[PDB]
Ligand binder design. Structure first.
Ligand SMILES: CN(C)CCCc1ccc2oc3nc(N)c(C(=O)O)cc3c(=O)c2c1
Length: 604
């Protein structure tokens, strides 16, 4: 049994969305077989004007047909097989926030879609992840579209409307943190009056309000949580956009013009990957392609507290000198695995990666299809977070080994250049101390040897202290990079994939529990499978957290503690080589005052 039309037909089992106004079914065309989104319920004019609406970020309304049996007005819309943004946020990998690249696609499509709607004059009123569909483009990247804006949601209401830019800020915060900005204790249900009190609290600059106790306080915050998977450079640019659109004051509201301007400023910026080798921290500098490198060093300082003049950059095993006027679009292309390492002559504190330390929530023995579903979603997102941090800690160590293996070669290049200037002084020394011996009232000569022999003696002390550094930069010379290969974790251990095996098992049990919740009750046979796999869900999470802390974190903190000591020894050797090289330049000019002095007397 199923309904049909003159051109389309759909099964009632293939139901997609179910709302108050109508329901949307997954249907096909009677002549082509292509899949369409069939929506089964003044109109003839406001619907044909939605047909001409053609935009990348808007679901195309193809045609309007009338059903056969009930003669109901049926809308033939574009089918989006990936679901809505809410479906994307339900996956455990996005439980603590979307990927940073995926987050930029959402912001670009949402802004690009509403801007086209404002050019035509359509107010969306309700903008939630349920109103934003996802389509895979021809290139493989996601494409987000708007669809439902005709005649919103309890969690995405303005305080004055609770009794346009508001729901957009809640959606972006939800997509960036994986959670809602204003959450009471028992959720926005019976604590609905608390939800209204949270919004009317209007802390202006703050964007979050977590009630971690029943009828307790409201923990405000103006910054993104630590679990946010976005880069620190993106949070600095995203925070003021949300804070200025999350307050009831129309006097202090931004409006679409200032919103579209500042959002376009973020999307027009390219990414420059920079890894602080002395702090063991990876960063992402969001800089426009037309800015100079001076502004680039400014953004590196605002994210690493490194002075611009002290920023010494390394790229692909060689030093990198950035001209203060060199545009950002002419910088070398960088990735997360091949960034621009920044080192400074000043001593820097070794911090490492900062992440939220979360534990496993206890599993309840109550057989509750809704309880086990909400429990499986939270515990699987925790493993995704631990699997995310594990891969980040592995990347930090692998980036650390390359940066250290490069820096020792850059130091050996500075040592070899000192040898070049040493041979220039030794040749000048010998060809001037012996050219006097050939020619040899004598105090004009004896004072030279008492000064030339002091130069050859102090120059020799540089040679002894240089070959010592050559012995320190040798394998096993109290500065070798061999410890980095024999301390932390490696891709050979395959720790990220060992956690990802247990993650897929927990996700399949979660997806099965997600299906078990749709079914109101299970049979006796399926009930025990739901209980047996529920216990396996705990053993998989316990096995992963044990392997995460007792292997990934222990080896990381052992590698980090070893790195903090090697940085001091490296900073100590750089100060000696710099002094020894400076002791070769000042004596290079001290032998210049004597090579022309007595060697060239005056006589007709
Ligand atoms: C990857 N798997 C988990 C997909 C999840 C289920 C699904 C699939 C396709 C869909 O395609 C839609 N296409 C539309 N045009 C509209 C609308 O316009 O409201 C709504 C939907 C869905 O909800 C939907 C859900």
């Amino acid at each position: 049994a199923m309904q049909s039309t003159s051109n389309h037909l759909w099964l009632l089992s293939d139901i997609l969305g179910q709302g108050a106004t109508a329901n949307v079914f997954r249907g096909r065309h009677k002549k082509t077989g292509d899949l369409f989104a069939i929506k089964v319920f003044v109109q003839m004019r406001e619907f044909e004007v939605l047909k001409k609406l053609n935009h990348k970020n808007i679901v195309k309304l193809f045609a309007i047909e009338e059903e056969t049996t009930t003669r109901h007005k049926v809308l033939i819309m574009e089918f989006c097989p990936c679901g809505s943004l809410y479906t994307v946020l339900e996956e455990p990998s996005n439980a603590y926030g979307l990927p940073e690249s995926e987050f930029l696609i959402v912001l670009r499509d949402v802004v690009g879609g509403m801007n086209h709607l404002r050019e035509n004059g359509i107010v969306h009123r309700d903008i939630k992840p349920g109103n934003i569909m996802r389509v895979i483009g021809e290139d493989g990247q996601s494409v987000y579209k708007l669809t439902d804006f005709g005649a919103g949601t309890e969690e995405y209401l303005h305080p004055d409307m609770y009794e346009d830019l508001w729901s957009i800020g809640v959606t972006f915060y939800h997509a960036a943190t994986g959670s809602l900005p204003f959450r009471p204790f028992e959720g926005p249900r019976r604590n609905k009056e608390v939800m209204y009190k949270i919004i009317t609290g209007k802390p202006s600059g703050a964007i979050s309000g977590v009630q971690k106790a029943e009828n307790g306080p409201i923990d405000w915050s103006g910054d993104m949580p630590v679990s946010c998977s976005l880069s620190r450079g993106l949070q600095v640019l995203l925070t003021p956009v949300l804070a200025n659109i999350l307050e009831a004051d129309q006097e202090k509201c931004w409006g679409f013009d200032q919103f579209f301007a500042e959002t376009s400023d973020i999307l027009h910026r390219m990414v420059i990957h920079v890894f602080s080798l002395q702090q063991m921290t990876a960063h992402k500098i969001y800089i426009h392609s037309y800015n100079t490198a001076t502004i680039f060093h400014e953004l590196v300082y605002k994210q690493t507290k490194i002075i611009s003049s002290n920023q010494e950059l390394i790229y692909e095993g060689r030093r990198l000198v950035l001209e203060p006027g060199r545009l950002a679009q002419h910088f070398p292309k960088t990735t997360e695995e091949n960034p621009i390492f920044v080192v400074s002559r000043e001593p820097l504190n070794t911090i490492g990666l900062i992440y939220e330390k979360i534990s496993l929530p206890k599993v309840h023995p109550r057989y509750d299809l809704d309880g086990d579903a909400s429990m499986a979603k939270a515990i699987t997102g925790v493993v995704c977070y631990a699997c995310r941090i594990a891969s980040t800690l592995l990347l930090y160590q692998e980036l650390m080994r390359k940066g250290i293996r490069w820096l020792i070669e850059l130091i050996k290049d500075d040592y070899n250049e000192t040898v070049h200037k040493k041979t220039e002084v030794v040749i000048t020394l010998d060809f001037c101390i012996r050219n006097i011996e050939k020619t040899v009232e004598l105090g004009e000569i004896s004072d030279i040897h008492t000064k030339l022999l002091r130069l050859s003696s102090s120059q020799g002390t540089i040679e002894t202290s240089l070959q010592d550094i050559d012995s320190r930069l040798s394998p096993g010379g109290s500065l070798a990079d061999a410890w980095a290969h024999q301390e932390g974790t490696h891709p050979k251990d395959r720790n990220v994939e060992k956690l990802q095996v247990l993650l897929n098992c927990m996700t399949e049990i979660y997806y099965q529990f997600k299906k078990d919740k749709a079914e109101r009750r299970l049979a006796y046979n399926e009930e025990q499978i739901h209980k047996f796999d529920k216990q396996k869900l705990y053993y998989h999470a316990t096995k992963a957290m044990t392997h995460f802390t007792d292997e990934c974190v222990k080896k990381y903190e052992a590698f980090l503690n070893k790195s903090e000591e090697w940085i001091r020894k490296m900073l100590h050797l750089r100060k000696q080589l710099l002094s020894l090289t400076n002791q070769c330049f000042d004596i290079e000019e001290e032998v210049s005052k004597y090579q022309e002095y007595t060697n060239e007397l005056q006589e007709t």
